[PDB]
Amino acid sequence: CPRYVKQSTLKLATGMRNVPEFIENGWEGMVDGWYGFRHQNSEGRGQAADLKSTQAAIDQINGKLNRLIGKTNEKFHQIEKEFSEVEGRIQDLEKYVEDTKIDLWSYNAELLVALENQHTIDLTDSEMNKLFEKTKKQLRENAEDMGNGCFKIYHKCDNACIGSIRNGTYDHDVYRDEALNNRFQI
C-alpha cells in the first residue's frame, strides 16, 4: 500500500503553465491539442494542432505517473503502532520510531512533488522554446519576432506556407529575393 504521510494534499502538475489574461497570453479555446498555429490573413483567424509536439509532451506526462503510480513495496507483519496502556521505555521507543519515520516520508513526499512539478513545468516550457526556435531556423530574414511568440512573415504566403510550416517542409525561397524592397529601405 502507499506510504502514510502527514500532508493532507499534494497536487502533481499534469499540464503546462496557466496564463489567464514571451507569449503574452493564452487562448482558452484551443482544446484539440497542446501546440498549434494561429494565423491572420484576408480570410480570418483559425486554430489547429501540431501532433508531434503534442504527443511528445503527452508521452512525458504519462511517463511521470508511471514512475510514481503503482510502484510500492510490500510489508506484512510489522510493529504495533497504537497502544491502549502506558508502558514507558519500550513503548516510548516504538512511538519514537514511528514518529521519526513518518517525518522522513512526509518530507520525501513533499520534496518529490516539488522537484518533479517544477521540472515538468520547465519541460513543457522547453518544448515551446524548441518549437519557436525550430520554426525560426526553418525561416530566415523573411519574418520578425514581435515578442509574443508570433512571427510576421515578410514573404507573402497564402495558407500553403502554414501547412508547410506544420510539417517542417516550408521552402522560404519563392519571394525571398525581393527582400531589400521588403522592409529594408534607405
Partner: protein, 50 residues
C-alpha cells in the same frame, strides 16, 4: 498587405489548480491530479488475502 501574421501561441483552460514548485509556492496549471489517496470504502473486503 505584404505580410501574413503567424501566431503559434499555447493552449489555456478557464479552471486551474495551484501547485507548489521548487521556485514558486503557488503556480496555476491547466490540470492536476491528486497524489495522496484518502477515504476509501469503509469495509474490509476479503480478497485476495485470506
Amino acid at each position: 498587405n505584404s505580410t501574413a501574421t503567424l501566431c503559434l501561441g499555447h493552449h489555456a483552460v478557464p479552471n486551474g489548480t495551484i501547485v507548489k514548485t521548487i521556485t514558486n509556492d503557488q503556480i496555476e496549471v491547466t490540470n492536476a491530479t491528486e497524489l495522496v489517496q484518502s477515504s476509501s470504502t469503509g469495509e474490509i473486503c476479503d480478497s485476495p488475502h485470506q
